């Protein structure tokens, strides 16, 4: 049972020193190569750092030359990564893992083998002010056909929020599209539901929004501006 525990998350300011710890278990630690993989939120996955079996730093990425540190605690089977001078975009969903290739198996030291991704933490590297959530009804157009109406959650911070539809009564057609991030760390999502168009009168249209950090549970309503 190979296991990797990731710690070092939470709300952190960019530009500040950061400490990330990954604990390894279920396999002999200090005989394998090891890897940190960058993963910008809202984007793909990219290699950021690594280290050899002998605890030798592989190097650093293009934009982070000579300002991160990767080290290995061989005593308690752990690995640490320290970051400095974060910006808004150096935020990443960093992942920890090891290498498949064994010492004296199949020249040169084998260091590839992205194999067992420990669930990487979600270090939130951003500096945004407290924005009161702005939920708003995307009103239904008078659409035979299928009506499309929504609720938009914009200018809110922190990002964690939840939208339910008619308190669970409306389940068919709900799609909460990802919140587009703006220049000033502003979040703007739109939950859109397609509903039968013959029930514009019998249905009172409510959406429930939950901003847990602000304890904002609001039962708003969608009405066509006409």
């Amino acid at each position: 049972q190979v296991q990797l525990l990731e710690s070092g998350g939470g709300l952190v300011q960019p530009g500040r020193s950061l400490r990330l710890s990954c604990a390894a278990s279920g396999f002999t630690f200090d005989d394998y190569a090891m890897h940190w993989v960058r993963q910008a939120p809202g984007k793909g996955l990219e290699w950021v750092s690594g280290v050899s079996w002998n605890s030798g730093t592989i190097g650093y990425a293009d934009s982070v030359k000579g300002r991160f540190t990767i080290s290995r605690d061989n005593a308690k089977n752990s690995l640490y990564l320290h970051m400095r001078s974060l910006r808004a975009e150096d935020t990443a969903l960093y992942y920890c893992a090891k290498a498949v290739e064994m010492v004296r198996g199949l020249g040169a030291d084998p260091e590839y083998g992205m194999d067992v991704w420990g669930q990487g933490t979600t270090v939130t590297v951003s500096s945004a002010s407290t924005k009161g959530p702005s939920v708003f009804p995307l009103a239904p157009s008078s659409k035979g056909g299928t009506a499309a109406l929504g609720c938009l959650v914009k200018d809110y911070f922190p990002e964690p929020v939840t939208v339910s539809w008619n308190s669970g009564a409306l389940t068919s057609g709900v799609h909460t599209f990802p919140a587009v991030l703006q220049s000033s760390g502003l979040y703007s999502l739109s939950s859109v539901v397609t509903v039968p168009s013959s029930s514009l009168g019998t249905q009172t249209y409510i959406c429930n929004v939950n901003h847990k950090p602000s304890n904002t549970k609001v039962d708003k309503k969608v009405e066509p501006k006409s």
């Binding site: 990219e46 190097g59 199949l106 991704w117």
Partner: protein
């Protein structure tokens, strides 16, 4: 840095026939022993990235057997031989001859569906929303398959880039539904100085790229 490309950017394949994806490099991955260093990796929606195959043909015990490796010199291919609808997901390839390591663009593979002309709607922002100081004009591209259909926001026939963000949902199990909410951001002053806003959709089945345009007020 070694130049790497993945082709094609997306290939919809039918179960029952093999598939060929390719990664192209700017350097020959041959070594003194003659072994390339291209390793293929996979990820599903909701999954962390996962391994596919080592070095294409140099194999370790336990790797899946349906994924074959071929190619030569600088350019190699991953071949999907055994067919299943699970093969859908994103693919990546790595080079280990020179440091640092780097991912390619990565490509997404999905099961093909019958090509449907999209239903396009357009939604003017509400006035009380307009009071906030920005106009959020909405376009709805419902049921365009594949995602190849492109969107063009036009205020008074403006060819523009930026300020338009199109959110597309995950592949809905119903007819591979692809629903897109396109938000166009306009200034409060810009709203009142122009009249018509047009969301244009270009789809393969749409011989006429539809132009849903609405006007201020009604």
């Amino acid at each position: 840095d070694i130049v790497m490309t993945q082709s094609p950017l997306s290939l919809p394949v039918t179960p029952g026939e093999p598939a060929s994806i390719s990664c192209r490099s700017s350097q020959s991955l041959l070594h003194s022993n003659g072994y390339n260093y291209l390793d293929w990796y996979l990820q599903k929606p909701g999954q962390s990235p996962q391994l596919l195959i080592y070095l294409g043909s140099n194999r370790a015990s336990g790797v899946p057997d349906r994924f074959s490796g071929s190619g030569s010199g600088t350019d190699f291919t991953l071949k999907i031989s055994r067919v299943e609808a699970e093969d859908v997901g994103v693919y990546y390839c790595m080079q280990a001859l020179q440091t640092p390591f780097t991912f390619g663009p990565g490509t997404k593979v999905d099961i093909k569906r019958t090509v449907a002309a999209p239903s396009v709607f357009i939604f003017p922002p509400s006035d009380e929303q307009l009071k906030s100081g920005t106009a959020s004009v909405v376009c709805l591209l419902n049921n365009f398959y594949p995602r190849e259909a492109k969107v063009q926001w036009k205020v008074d026939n403006a060819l523009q880039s930026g300020n338009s963000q199109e959110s597309v949902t995950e592949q809905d199990s119903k007819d591979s539904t692809y629903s897109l909410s396109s938000t166009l951001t306009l200034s409060k002053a810009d709203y009142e100085k122009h009249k018509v806003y047009a969301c244009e959709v270009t789809h393969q089945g749409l011989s006429s790229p539809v132009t849903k345009s609405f006007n201020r007020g009604e």
